Amino acid sequence: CHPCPWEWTFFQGNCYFMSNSQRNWHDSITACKEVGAQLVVIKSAEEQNFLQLQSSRSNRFTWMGLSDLNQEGTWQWVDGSPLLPSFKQYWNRGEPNNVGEEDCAEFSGNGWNDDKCNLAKFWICKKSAASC
Ligand SMILES: NC[C@H](O)CO[C@H]1O[C@H](CO)[C@@H](O)[C@H](O)[C@@H]1n1cc(-c2ccccc2)nn1
Ligand SMILES: [Ca+2]
Ligand SMILES: [Ca+2]
């Protein structure tokens, strides 16, 4: 039995996957849906540091499933769940700044940054690990 698919990464009962091509934010969640996964929604502190590490050490700007397209200033994960105050420390200093209108969040260096959703970047999918 295999808890995660071929060449996916495993962490705390979940299966993650960093793309090796680039897409815009909407095309990215589509991509994850195509594999029965979701553009990552972070739920733990350790999950953040885990993903933030894989993303940085590959020197790749990476989409995550977080946006404010429901309403400006209201950051909300693609599962509807809101962005908790606890998680707001993971923004990069001076972010989110909404320079030129920016409604989607990405892994950039040590933390997160808001960028333009139509800007093409890499992405990370998340799904529940299978039971053995
Ligand atoms: N992958 C994105 C990468 O991290 C680059 O980040 C920067 O440019 C991104 C633009 O693509 C921003 O969305 C980030 O906020 C960040 N920025 C931009 C600015 C800024 C402010 C005033 C005038 C001009 C520029 N201040 N911070
Ligand atoms: Ca914004
Ligand atoms: Ca920004």
UniProtKB/Swiss-Prot annotation:
Changing N113D: Loss of binding to ICAM3 and HIV-1 gp120. Ca(2+) binds at E95, N97, V99, E102, N113, D114. The lineage of its organism: Eukaryota, Metazoa, Chordata, Craniata, Vertebrata. It comes from Homo sapiens. Predominantly expressed in dendritic cells and in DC-residing tissues. Also found in placental macrophages, endothelial cells of placental vascular channels, peripheral blood mononuclear cells, and THP-1 monocytes. It comes from the Eukaryota. Pathogen-recognition receptor expressed on the surface of immature dendritic cells (DCs) and involved in initiation of primary immune response. Thought to mediate the endocytosis of pathogens which are subsequently degraded in lysosomal compartments. The receptor returns to the cell membrane surface and the pathogen-derived antigens are presented to resting T-cells via MHC class II proteins to initiate the adaptive immune response. Homotetramer. Interacts with C1QBP; the interaction is indicative for a C1q:C1QBP:CD209 signaling complex. Interacts with ICAM2 and ICAM3 by binding to mannose-like carbohydrates. Interacts (via C-type lectin domain) with CEACAM1 (via Lewis X moieties); this interaction is regulated by the glycosylation pattern of CEACAM1 on cell types and regulates contact between dendritic cells and neutrophils. (Microbial infection) Interacts with HIV-1 and HIV-2 gp120. Residues 11-126 form the C-type lectin domain. The tandem repeat domain, also called neck domain, mediates oligomerization. In vitro, is a receptor for HIV-1 and transmits HIV-1 either in trans without DC infection, or in cis following a DC infection to permissive T-cells to induce a robust infection. Bound HIV-1 remains infectious over a prolonged period of time and it is proposed that bound HIV-1 is not degraded but protected in non-lysosomal acidic organelles within the DCs close to the cell membrane thus contributing to the HIV-1 infectious potential during transport by DCs from the periphery to lymphoid organs. Changing E72A: Loss of binding to ICAM3 and HIV-1 gp120. Changing D68A: Loss of binding to ICAM3 and HIV-1 gp120. This is CD209 antigen. The gene is CD209. Disulfide bonds join C4-C15, C32-C125, C104-C117.
